[PDB]
Amino acid sequence: GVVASQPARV
Amino acid sequence: IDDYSTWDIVKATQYGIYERCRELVEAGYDVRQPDKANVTLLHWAAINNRIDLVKYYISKGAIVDQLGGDLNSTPLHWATRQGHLSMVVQLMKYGADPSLIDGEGCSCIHLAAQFGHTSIVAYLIAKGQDVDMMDQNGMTPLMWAAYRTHSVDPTRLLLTFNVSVNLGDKYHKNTALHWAVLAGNTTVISLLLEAGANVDAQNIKGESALDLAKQRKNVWMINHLQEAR
């Protein structure tokens, strides 16, 4: 897949 | 058959549908206008490695290092987190600043270290970033690697440079070895001992790395650390 969510806290 | 003529600009950027994005921009979509998540189009192009979309958006005046998202990061941060070397090179050619820090305190070399992107770490060092650069939390790339990458690289790569193996982070004084022990990162422990990590150096609570190994009742870690004393 493509990246469709923003980076988030671990 | 879906031809993308109904896709919105964000989704068409993520998927790299170049002509759809171009027609929406020419129909009036501002390339600087963030979405509801405070994320710019450049961000989505960068994290999906859309090299050509990135040139196009920048030529339309997209701000190269615009902070966005909940982690308050540049597009280059996003590319670095995701592991796109080609995008990191491309963004840095247009002037993206690898030393900018995000909302977690990290610049690009720390992000590349903590997600295991060994060739991006090597590239940033090749472009002049200091191997022992501290982030806003006093972490070095070697500490991040010890803490988060349970693998030979990027730790092996960092130790090929004149790293100072016994620095401690700013607010705990944990060395890389301390971090590896805390995390149970057995791959990295042997590399740091072979590289000269002092097993007795104490952190801000007075615990050495060998103290932390004893606390966790891990005989393999206690044995390996003691035999290196």
Nearest CA in chain B to A4: B14
Question: Could you give the number of structural domains in chain B?
Answer: 1
Q: What is the DSSP string of B157-222?
A: HHHTS---TT-B-TTT--BHHHHHHHHT-HHHHHHHHHTT--SS-B-TTS-BHHHHHHHTT-HHHH
What approach was used to elucidate this structure?
A: X-ray
Q: What is the DSSP string of B89-148?
A: HHHHHTT--TT---TTS--HHHHHHHTT-HHHHHHHHHTT--TT---TTS--HHHHHHHH
> What are the residues whose beta carbons fall under 8 Å from the beta carbon of B171, sequence distance 6 or more?
B137, B138, B204
State the virtual CA torsion across B113, B116, B119, B125 in degrees, nearest 10. 10
**Final resolution, Å:** 2.2
CA distance B24 to B18: 10
CATH number at residue B181: 1.25.40.20
Q: Do B70 and A3 touch (CB under 8 A)?
A: no
Nearest by CB: B14 against A2, A7, A8: A2
For residue B73, give the 3-state DSSP assignment.
Answer: strand
Domain limits at B59?
1-229
State the virtual CA torsion across A7, B48, B24, B96 in degrees, nearest 10. 80
Q: Do B44 and A7 touch (CB under 8 A)?
A: no
State the virtual CA torsion across B18, B23, B29, B35 in degrees, nearest 10. -30
Nearest by CB: B71 against A3, A4, A7: A7
State the virtual CA torsion across B110, B115, B117, B121 in degrees, nearest 10. 10
Q: How many CB atoms lie within 10 A of CB B194?
A: 11
